[PDB]
């Protein structure tokens, strides 16, 4: 039993011992946003999610800067944020579209209720 318990704390040797992070309200908020990425952009379509639940083993990081992609692919440091949800809070394009869709549903629902 104790040797089983130790083996479930890590992904295993096949993936070089990835650990399961402690779940928090900030980590859970990020994973919920990733699942609902289909509705962020009306002109972008995605495949179905691999699993309905959250993955047991995962890790969080940022993409390293490259000298070659100074103009092609690089975000200025003022626009960078600490977490995924704050990035969604910042950009105007996603906020502008989402508030129009949400208001339309409520305006439809208000007529539905009446």
């Amino acid at each position: 039993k104790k040797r089983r318990k130790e083996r479930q704390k890590t992904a295993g040797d096949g993936w070089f011992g990835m650990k399961a992070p402690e779940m928090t309200n900030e980590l859970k908020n990020d994973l919920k946003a990733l699942k609902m990425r289909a509705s962020m952009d009306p002109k972008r379509f995605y495949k179905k999610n691999d699993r309905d639940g959250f993955p047991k083993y995962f890790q969080i990081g940022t993409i390293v800067d490259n000298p070659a992609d100074f103009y092609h692919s690089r975000i200025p440091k003022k626009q960078r944020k600490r977490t995924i949800v704050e990035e969604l809070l910042a950009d105007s394009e996603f906020r502008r579209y989402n508030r129009r869709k949400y208001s339309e549903i409520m305006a439809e629902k208000a007529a539905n209720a009446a």
Binding site: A33, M36, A38, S39, V85, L88, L89, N98, I105
Partner: peptide, 17 residues
């Protein structure tokens, strides 16, 4: 509250879709 309201609005749109 800005973060929490954003997620519920996104959840409402995704559930409808």
């Amino acid at each position: 509250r800005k973060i929490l309201a954003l997620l519920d609005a996104l959840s409402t749109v995704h559930s409808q879709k």
